[PDB]
Enzyme design. Structure first.
Site, PDB file in Angstrom:
ATOM      1  N   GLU A   2      11.864   8.133  40.730  1.00  0.00           N
ATOM      2  CA  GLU A   2      11.959   8.269  39.283  1.00  0.00           C
ATOM      3  C   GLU A   2      11.253   9.522  38.789  1.00  0.00           C
ATOM      4  O   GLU A   2      10.419  10.101  39.482  1.00  0.00           O
ATOM      5  CB  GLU A   2      11.359   7.041  38.600  1.00  0.00           C
ATOM      6  N   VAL A   3      11.611   9.941  37.583  1.00  0.00           N
ATOM      7  CA  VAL A   3      11.021  11.115  36.963  1.00  0.00           C
ATOM      8  C   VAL A   3      10.449  10.648  35.633  1.00  0.00           C
ATOM      9  O   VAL A   3      11.177  10.131  34.794  1.00  0.00           O
ATOM     10  CB  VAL A   3      12.087  12.213  36.713  1.00  0.00           C
ATOM     11  N   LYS A  60       8.012  14.228  38.886  1.00  0.00           N
ATOM     12  CA  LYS A  60       8.933  13.553  39.784  1.00  0.00           C
ATOM     13  C   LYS A  60       8.093  12.774  40.782  1.00  0.00           C
ATOM     14  O   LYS A  60       7.218  13.335  41.447  1.00  0.00           O
ATOM     15  CB  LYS A  60       9.814  14.579  40.505  1.00  0.00           C
ATOM     16  N   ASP A 106      24.463  21.427  44.735  1.00  0.00           N
ATOM     17  CA  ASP A 106      24.841  20.253  43.943  1.00  0.00           C
ATOM     18  C   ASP A 106      24.831  20.517  42.447  1.00  0.00           C
ATOM     19  O   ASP A 106      24.281  19.742  41.667  1.00  0.00           O
ATOM     20  CB  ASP A 106      23.934  19.064  44.253  1.00  0.00           C
TER      21      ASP A 106
HETATM   22  C1  LIG Z   1      15.278   6.764  28.570  1.00  0.00           C
HETATM   23  C2  LIG Z   1      16.256   7.274  27.594  1.00  0.00           C
HETATM   24  C3  LIG Z   1      15.739   8.562  26.778  1.00  0.00           C
HETATM   25  C4  LIG Z   1      15.661   9.855  27.650  1.00  0.00           C
HETATM   26  C5  LIG Z   1      17.034  10.173  28.330  1.00  0.00           C
HETATM   27  N1  LIG Z   1      16.892  11.383  29.228  1.00  0.00           N
HETATM   28  C6  LIG Z   1      16.906  12.699  28.553  1.00  0.00           C
HETATM   29  C7  LIG Z   1      16.028  13.710  29.247  1.00  0.00           C
HETATM   30  C8  LIG Z   1      15.084  14.567  28.520  1.00  0.00           C
HETATM   31  C9  LIG Z   1      14.253  15.521  29.255  1.00  0.00           C
HETATM   32  C10 LIG Z   1      14.361  15.616  30.693  1.00  0.00           C
HETATM   33  C11 LIG Z   1      15.309  14.760  31.431  1.00  0.00           C
HETATM   34  C12 LIG Z   1      16.120  13.830  30.709  1.00  0.00           C
HETATM   35  C13 LIG Z   1      15.201  15.076  32.841  1.00  0.00           C
HETATM   36  C14 LIG Z   1      14.217  16.093  32.972  1.00  0.00           C
HETATM   37  C15 LIG Z   1      13.474  16.978  33.839  1.00  0.00           C
HETATM   38  C16 LIG Z   1      13.609  17.084  35.357  1.00  0.00           C
HETATM   39  C17 LIG Z   1      13.000  18.230  36.032  1.00  0.00           C
HETATM   40  C18 LIG Z   1      13.105  18.400  37.477  1.00  0.00           C
HETATM   41  C19 LIG Z   1      13.835  17.409  38.291  1.00  0.00           C
HETATM   42  C20 LIG Z   1      13.948  17.574  39.743  1.00  0.00           C
HETATM   43  O1  LIG Z   1      13.247  18.566  40.307  1.00  0.00           O
HETATM   44  O2  LIG Z   1      14.646  16.845  40.397  1.00  0.00           O
HETATM   45  C21 LIG Z   1      14.446  16.256  37.620  1.00  0.00           C
HETATM   46  C22 LIG Z   1      14.333  16.104  36.182  1.00  0.00           C
HETATM   47  N2  LIG Z   1      12.620  17.733  33.071  1.00  0.00           N
HETATM   48  N3  LIG Z   1      12.809  17.350  31.772  1.00  0.00           N
HETATM   49  C23 LIG Z   1      13.741  16.388  31.669  1.00  0.00           C
HETATM   50  C24 LIG Z   1      17.526   8.957  29.181  1.00  0.00           C
HETATM   51  C25 LIG Z   1      17.574   7.619  28.367  1.00  0.00           C
END
Ligand SMILES: C[C@H]1CC[C@@H](NCc2ccc3c(c2)Cc2c(-c4ccc(C(=O)O)cc4)n[nH]c2-3)CC1
Length: 269
Positions: A21-22, A37, A129
């Site tokens: 999860e993040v 993460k 990806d």
């Molecule tokens: C829970 C509810 C409200 C928030 C929604 N997600 C919006 C959102 C807003 C900001 C985000 C991310 C998603 C994902 C993410 C990441 C991130 C960075 C790096 C990775 C990685 O290295 O795999 C994955 C995700 N940074 N900021 C954000 C989902 C439903």
């Protein structure tokens, strides 16, 4: 030394999946927001190896169109990666089902996407990806390429390494990955970028996968752009897609040439 500045509160789940999860973390003192993460190094050849590679690659990343890497913390089995928080969310949600988005926004997002890809390829890194769910947006709507869990090096010491590992997401993967044992990394990322362009302009993916047995894919190669999914895309960006979504990776347009495409340099439109 300011006390508590190293304390981050996890206040919201940003994403969840195989990796784990993040969570959104806010600094106890500064209130700075970042994405953390959480990956539990379970199994063996699994996380213990995969998460370590993802970390080494993140440590090489430094570009305005790539998610920033702040550092990593390891506490036994649990692995913590401090990444950029992009309040804008996923480009995926800016895509209206069956509609897409205004052409200028898509062109802007595509410019930023190319900028990020050029950067990664420039330092010998392929993402493998690329898709709307991995393209994040910050507060100002600046596109950020995220998640390097599938990324790898294709160029080292000026020598290119051909790839053979089948990875990615079927709707976005290049046909050569399903037809050849080995392939050049770069054309594979350009392809997925094209499918992303298609999604932004039509709000639907062209095919389940790029193969003969796939109806829409065969129609595309037959240039049946009439009425079909490409009907919703103006002729200028469509001319670009015709050059990107080319079967032969050797004949596929390169990024330097995409930069020269007419729609790509078309003001606003
Ligand atoms: C829970 C509810 C409200 C928030 C929604 N997600 C919006 C959102 C807003 C900001 C985000 C991310 C998603 C994902 C993410 C990441 C991130 C960075 C790096 C990775 C990685 O290295 O795999 C994955 C995700 N940074 N900021 C954000 C989902 C439903």
């Amino acid at each position: 030394a300011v006390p508590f500045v190293e304390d981050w509160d996890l206040v919201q789940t940003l994403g969840e999946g195989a990796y784990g999860e993040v969570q959104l973390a806010v600094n106890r003192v500064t209130e700075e927001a970042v994405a953390v993460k959480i990956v539990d190094m379970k199994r063996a050849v699994d996380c213990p190896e995969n998460i370590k590679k993802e970390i080494c690659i993140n440590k090489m990343l430094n570009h305005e169109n790539v998610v920033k890497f702040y550092g990593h913390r390891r506490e036994g089995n649990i692995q913590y990666l401090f990444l950029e928080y992009c309040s804008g969310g996923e480009l995926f949600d800016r895509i209206e089902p069956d509609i897409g988005m205004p052409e200028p926004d898509a062109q802007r997002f595509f410019h930023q996407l190319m900028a990020g890809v050029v950067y990664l390829h420039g330092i010998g890194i392929t993402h493998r990806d690329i898709k709307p769910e991995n393209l994040l947006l910050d507060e100002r709507d600046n596109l950020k390429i995220s998640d390097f869990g599938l990324a790898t090096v294709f160029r080292y010491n000026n020598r290119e390494r051909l790839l053979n590992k089948m990875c990615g997401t079927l709707p976005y993967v290049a046909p050569e990955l399903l037809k050849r044992r080995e392939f050049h990394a770069e054309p594979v990322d350009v392809w997925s970028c094209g499918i992303v362009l298609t999604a932004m302009l039509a709000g639907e993916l062209p095919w389940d996968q790029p193969s003969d047995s796939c109806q829409e894919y065969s129609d595309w190669k037959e240039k049946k752009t009439y009425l079909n999914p490409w009907k919703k895309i103006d002729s200028a960006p469509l001319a670009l897609l015709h050059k990107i979504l080319v079967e032969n990776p050797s004949a596929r347009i390169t990024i330097p040439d995409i930069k020269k495409d007419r729609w790509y340099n078309k003001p606003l439109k």
